[PDB]
């Protein structure tokens, strides 16, 4: 329902009760789909740790990420011999250097497998991406939370072609209200949820030309 291109059209129809769930669903979607530099957070959250400690980190998303990296010894293990002149810091660089390079992993049972450099990064990111409980996501994203969640929000079907339909002045006005909603970082979800509730109830008429013209036409009659 979130990916309905006419969400703003039918959103005012539904009840106060269904709005409370639609606003939460839409809210959680923004935080989960929001993007963050994974190479930075995984590096900060496992610096100085050993590979054994990484496989049992307190953060489930850190385990998921690392578990997908450790499958491929060649990306992190230090060589016995070297060409003449943290562990994940080595891993992330080897996976970026060997972008097209193939790494071998051996399954629990004898089975082997070859993966490309980025296919391991992508697999590790996906593993992590499906582990955070949104709150931890909000904490690590606290700095770019309003920018990142907004980027997600714009890509929804209901927002496709909003600036061309309502003008750039209205679009940037929606952005301001989107950003302004975030008072504290401890209430970021509740904040943006309320913003989405208030606007979905109004069908975002407060940012559309049609809605504003209807409002002045509705206001003058008093």
């Amino acid at each position: 329902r979130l990916l309905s291109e006419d969400l703003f059209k039918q959103s005012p129809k539904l009840s106060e009760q269904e709005l409370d769930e639609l606003a939460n669903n839409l809210a959680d979607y923004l935080f989960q789909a929001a993007d963050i530099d994974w190479h930075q957070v995984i590096s900060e959250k496992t610096r100085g740790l050993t590979t054994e400690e990484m496989a049992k980190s307190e953060h489930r998303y850190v385990q998921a990420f690392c578990r997908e990296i450790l499958k491929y010894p060649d990306c992190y293990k230090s060589a016995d011999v070297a060409s003449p002149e943290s562990v994940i810091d080595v891993a992330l660089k080897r996976l970026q250097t060997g972008r097209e390079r193939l790494f071998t992993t051996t399954d629990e049972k004898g089975n082997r497998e070859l993966k490309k450099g980025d296919a391991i990064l992508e697999s590790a990111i996906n593993a992590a991406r499906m582990a955070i409980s949104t709150e931890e996501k909000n904490t690590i994203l606290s700095n770019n939370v309003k920018s990142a969640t907004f980027d997600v929000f714009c890509e929804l079907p209901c927002m496709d072609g909003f600036a061309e339909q309502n003008g750039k002045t209205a679009f940037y006005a929606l952005r301001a209200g989107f950003y302004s909603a975030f008072k504290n970082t401890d209430t970021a979800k509740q904040d943006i949820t309320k913003f989405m509730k208030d606007n979905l109830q109004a069908g975002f008429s407060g940012y559309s030309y049609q809605g504003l013209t209807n409002r002045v036409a509705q206001l003058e009659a008093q």
Partner: protein, 361 residues
């Protein structure tokens, strides 16, 4: 039960049934995924380029992402061919010097995921030789991702003589994309490379004498040809027609240090036994879509004669269907009764495991 035949390429995947003179299905080897359906395969992925991020599981002939590869086959079986793999023996293909791990994984997937009653993995260049009705001869297999020169002796390749050349159709497409900016056009995006590809496939040809074609294109506009883009626009190209495939014979055009396909064939022959060299010169087969350029065969002999002994008779073989000669060779092979004892049964796999591929194939 009829046997299936699947030729997996870097750029294109050809699938069909054994016995047929051609594949029933032909689609790009691409997987598009959104930004979290969860995946799209084939032309459908290209039509939805705007939504998806497209990637190639086979790169330079080798599988690089088995999650995507497993999906290509799932799409090949249930969507393209519309069959159940558990009631069809499957003949797959692979590049020369294919990593042993990929040999194993290709087998592991067929039996554990698709549960094929039996399967087999053949070298692509070897199948191309069968399609030409030979057991001895050298095969130039040039597709989208990689070019190989593979000498064969009585149905068996010669691993020591095989040379790999990372110069194929994609590189030529990109080269055409770049030289077209000399006429003032702009082809840079990943979507435009797909457009310029079709221009290359339809308007490019190999020049027998390169500089005599350059002088011709300079002294006249008789070689200039026009192409209508998907957006309704129209462009004309002149010497870019034959300058593009010339990169095969002169990789220096791409700033590449490698040798030409003519010399790479020669070098490959010059790594075999002195005795058999003759049969190779007389059985030089051209395979893959990147050998479809008109005038390429009539160019190759001129290029290798200058390298080969003048006494030896050279004969180049360019089958009119050499774009699918790999699949055709697979169709012939998988249909023979005398081959039915060479498949890899489910029993043999349950016993030995994925490593079975190394002794059977």
């Amino acid at each position: 039960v009829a046997a299936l035949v699947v030729d997996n390429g870097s750029g294109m995947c050809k699938a069909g049934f054994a016995g047929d003179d051609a594949p029933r299905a032909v689609f790009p080897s691409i997987v598009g995924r959104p930004r979290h359906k969860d995946s799209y395969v084939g032309d459908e992925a290209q039509s939805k380029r705007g939504i998806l991020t497209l990637k190639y599981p086979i790169e330079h002939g080798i599988v690089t992402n088995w999650d995507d590869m497993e999906k290509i086959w799932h799409h090949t079986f249930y969507n393209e061919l519309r069959v159940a793999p558990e009631e069809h023996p499957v003949l797959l293909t692979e590049a020369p010097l294919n990593p042993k791990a990929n040999r194993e994984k290709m087998t592991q997937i067929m039996f554990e995921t698709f549960n094929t009653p039996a399967m087999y993995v053949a070298i692509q260049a070897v199948l191309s030789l069968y399609a030409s009705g030979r057991t001895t001869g050298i095969v130039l297999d040039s597709g989208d991702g990689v070019s190989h020169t593979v000498p064969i002796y009585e149905g068996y390749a010669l691993p020591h003589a095989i040379l790999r050349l990372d110069l194929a159709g994609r590189d030529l497409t990109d080269y055409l994309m770049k030289i077209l900016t000399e006429r003032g056009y702009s082809f840079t995006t990943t979507a435009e490379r797909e457009i310029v590809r079709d221009i290359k496939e339809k308007l490019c040809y190999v020049a027998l004498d390169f500089e005599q074609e350059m002088a011709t294109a300079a002294s006249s506009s008789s070689l200039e040809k026009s192409y209508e883009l998907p957006d309704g626009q129209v462009i004309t190209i002149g010497n870019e027609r034959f300058r593009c495939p010339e990169a095969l014979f002169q990789p220096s055009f791409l700033g590449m240090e490698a040798c030409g396909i003519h010399e790479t064939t020669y070098n490959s022959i010059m790594k075999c036994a002195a005795a058999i060299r003759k049969d190779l010169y007389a059985n030089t087969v051209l395979s893959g879509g990147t050998t479809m350029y008109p005038g390429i065969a009539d160019r190759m002999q001129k290029e290798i004669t200058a390298l080969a002994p003048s006494t030896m008779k050279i004969k180049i073989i360019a089958p009119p269907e050499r774009k699918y000669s790999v699949w055709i060779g697979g169709s012939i092979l998988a249909s023979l009764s005398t081959f039915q004892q060479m498949w890899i049964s489910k029993q043999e796999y349950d016993e030995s495991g994925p490593s079975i591929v190394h002794r059977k194939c």
